[PDB]
Design a protein around this nucleic acid. Sequence first.
RNA 1: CGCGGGGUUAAGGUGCCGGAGUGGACGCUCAUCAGACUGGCGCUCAAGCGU
RNA 2: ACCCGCACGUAGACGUAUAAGAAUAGGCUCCGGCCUCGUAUCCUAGCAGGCGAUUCCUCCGCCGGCCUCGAAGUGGCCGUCGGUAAUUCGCGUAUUGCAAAGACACGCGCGGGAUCAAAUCAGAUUUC
Lengths: 131, 128, 174, 170, 52, 204, 108
Amino acid sequence: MVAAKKHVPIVKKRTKRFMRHQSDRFKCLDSAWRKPKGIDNRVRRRFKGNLAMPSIGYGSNKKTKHMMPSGHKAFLVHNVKDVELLLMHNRTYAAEIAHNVSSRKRIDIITRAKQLGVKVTNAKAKVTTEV
Amino acid sequence: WRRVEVGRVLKLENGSLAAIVEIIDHKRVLADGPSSDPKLATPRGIVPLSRALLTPIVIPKLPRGARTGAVKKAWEAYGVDAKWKETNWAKKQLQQERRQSLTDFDRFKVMRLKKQRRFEERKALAKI
Amino acid sequence: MGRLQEYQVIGRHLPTEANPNPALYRMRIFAPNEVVAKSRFWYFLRGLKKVKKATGEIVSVNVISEKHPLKVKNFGIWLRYDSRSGTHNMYKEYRETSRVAAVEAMYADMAARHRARFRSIHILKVVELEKTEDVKRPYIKQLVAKNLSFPLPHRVPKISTKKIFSAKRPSTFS
Amino acid sequence: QKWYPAEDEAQPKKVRKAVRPWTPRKSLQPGTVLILLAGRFRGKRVVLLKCLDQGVLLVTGPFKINGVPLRRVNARYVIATSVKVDLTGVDQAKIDEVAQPKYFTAASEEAFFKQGEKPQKKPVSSTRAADQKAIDKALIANIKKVDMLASYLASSFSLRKGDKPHLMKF
Amino acid sequence: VQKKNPLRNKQIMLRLNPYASTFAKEKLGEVKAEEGKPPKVPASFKELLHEA
Amino acid sequence: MSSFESVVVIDGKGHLLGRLASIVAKQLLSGQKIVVVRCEALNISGEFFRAKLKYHAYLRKMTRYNPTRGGPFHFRAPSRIFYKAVRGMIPHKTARGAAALERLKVFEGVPPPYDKKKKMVVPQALRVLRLQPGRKYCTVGRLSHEVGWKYQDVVARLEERRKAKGAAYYERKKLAARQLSEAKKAAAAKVDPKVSEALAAYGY
Amino acid sequence: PSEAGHRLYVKGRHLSYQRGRRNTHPKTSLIKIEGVDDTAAANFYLGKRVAYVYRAQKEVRGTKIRVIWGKITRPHGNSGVVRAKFTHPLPARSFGASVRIMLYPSSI
RNA sequence: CGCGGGGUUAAGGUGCCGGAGUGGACGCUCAUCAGACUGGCGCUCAAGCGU
RNA sequence: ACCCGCACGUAGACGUAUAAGAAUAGGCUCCGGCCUCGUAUCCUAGCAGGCGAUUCCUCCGCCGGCCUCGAAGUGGCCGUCGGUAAUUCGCGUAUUGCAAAGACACGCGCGGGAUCAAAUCAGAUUUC
């Protein structure tokens, strides 16, 4: 037995993203959400068949917020001292090695995390197995 | 064919018979159903003509307005139950009531016995 | 109007020191339930004897069941219908087994032929034509004639509305 | 136990959910002919020997008559017919023996060299085969004694055109 | 944490009302009427009913 | 009662147009393959001239430009009239409506692949069950005659040839009935009657 | 030589989804069962499993046949139509398609 | 008027498009472009009108 | 049509069986009689359906002959061969254990070569 904690089932109220209105038509408009401010904008007036806007009713359960599908929460690590901070939180948190960590430091983090019982999300990074 | 008249017994919908006591309107009749068979009995009351089928049995001399005792006496005098038993509608009804009462084993025995009879009719037809 | 019932509504003024022991006015009202019977009784006593619901009370509300509902009889009903032009008095015959059934048919007939409402009809009186020949409506006299007997031609067979397709064309001799 | 709780893991509260015996349908009597609705013996007519627990039924379609071995089946996947065969002579001790809930249960060179190879389909038994014969002996004798029933149990049930299960009399 | 209907849950009814068990046991909901020959309706009431 | 069949052959003689059309359209959207034979013998309630002038109102709806694209195409065959009646009550602007309409085959008379098969009738749309006896009716085929259909006499002859072949079917069928019934009687003479009383008690 | 079919399901047709006039809810599907024309008959098939069988394009577990499983929940209307819920909503191209109403769970 | 699951309704509807009755009782109406508490198809012992 | 090389196997089958018409104030028929009701008729047994019998000349299917079908094309008779519980059995159906990648054959295709018959512009291209 080594997994995440016992947690209530993870329910996502909405899996799709909220796209900005008319952002699929214009290349100058990024898909990041912007609240429409026009008076006659039917997205803002919430007419039928239009885009929904983000609301606080779409929020996630506080017991499963920030939680991965495995049940752990992501903990960004830059060195070995950072994974050592998860000695007492091995079942609640998983190690996420930072993108600018070198290969040997990544090997050090992965080795220590395995001994501590901490899962690593990106353990298939720039390393390989030698026999 | 058939005409509505005092003494005309008619089958309703539920496998029951009711003799016309008096004609109320072009669409409704007063009818009374005095019998001994619980399935063929009918309470005295207004019977719409749309929900009734005329039966070729006639009570010969029914006084109009006859109450339940007189209609029962005429019913037993003619033998309306036996003539309903012999006509085609009740033979079809009994065939249907027996048909819906087969179980799975009864259906298997029906198909097997039909196969034996069928082989015998094939022999009889091959004679011809 | 639905399952109408004949209600015997007795009602009287409120008793006062100056005027004790009122007159106990009684009326027969055909209504679906008791609340309509009481309301129509007051609507009529507001009209006739000038007593009010606030200054009056209901003595009794009794169901008047038909004595012989298994015997077909002739009813003659007098009625006053307020039309667009004005109020008119009529009188109509009905062959029913109960006074309630006659009033129900009356309401259906005056709704179909004259487009009359429930609130626009005042049933003056409902009587039974015990003696033959009292009926004056020709249709009713046809039914009261000697030794009536008529066939039922072209009888549409009651087929199931969920039986969509039939293999055999049906017959209308039943 | 051995370890102190190393993380604040909450124990579950005591549930007030007790186990009471399953009450079967009045049509599920010992000896009733059952029509299977699912599985690899789907549509085959068997004979119920004993009603077990939590919905399970011990059934056996005499292997000689129909190829259904001594098996278990959920009661929600069977249709109980009106035919009940007499079980006089069938040893109830043998039925009780097979009805226990453990009858239908079960790193080296060869372990490595067997990886990726198809598992062998196991032959049955020498005592389970005898158990089937012991129950079937009296059952088949009674079924033959019953008129026409042996050909009934050998035929698979199926739905034809125009047959409505809601208007039937199973 | 969870409201239970006393009309559906008998234990909740017994908790709120301890009389429910002996109300059901002694059949106070199927109580019979007083015995003896009932009198007939007065003729005056009948002639008032079927008036003109 | 309720049956799911391969294909339902509907004999259109003595059927109201709209009612049979509605039943057929509901069947097509349900997923039933429908063929309708004898489309010339459908009935429209009312008089001749009412449906006649309504159809002239339909021909009067004409586009301003050349009648080639987007104009109301006027088809004068009775089966095309029934197809228009079905199509007006099916969502033809959707692909589901296109599939439902492609499930339907309308025909004049009884074509050769459809005179070998049993023809059904719809009691909810028959003229003798829906129309009052005192009312009048018109035939779609003679309506097509009086607007401009050019193929009426021809289907009349191949219709009466079909009727002659049906008369052949029933002299053969009376013949087959002779040996079937006399085989039934001769089989009842050698009926080994335990099976007979068993089948009588079991109903058959 | 048996020469006989083996059918242990009632044929059904998936008509549409539960809907009003301009609002369609794909989570529930309206299905007509062959032979069921009244609410009383529909009451028999309540709880029974329904299977939508279709060949797609491509073999996966040795076959190209895929099946979406569901259950009859309640009757719909007065003509014997039933409402059915499936793991995921039924395809909209299966409007008017053949589904298989099984005889389990069985209370017979 | 937060995001969902189940149940029940309001106004409006149950011939098809369109989910739900070619439901039931009583009458009337054939209109050479009836009428629709009609949008189209179409409907006439209605799929119209009054209860 | 051949020669080399390469590639892949259903807007909804599960018994997806059923031919006059004509009328609905009548029709059918054995000439006895029959008709609200297609709530009917056929067919429905065996490892997703085996072996050997006992026993039946009943049914189905394939090829030839005789003829039949044109409307948008098909069926009958005879003959050959194969299978064939109408009746009765001895064998195998299991641990798939309470419902959820081998070989052969037949086809549709390509990438080149030349094989007929043609088309377009002796000589260039294209087409099953």
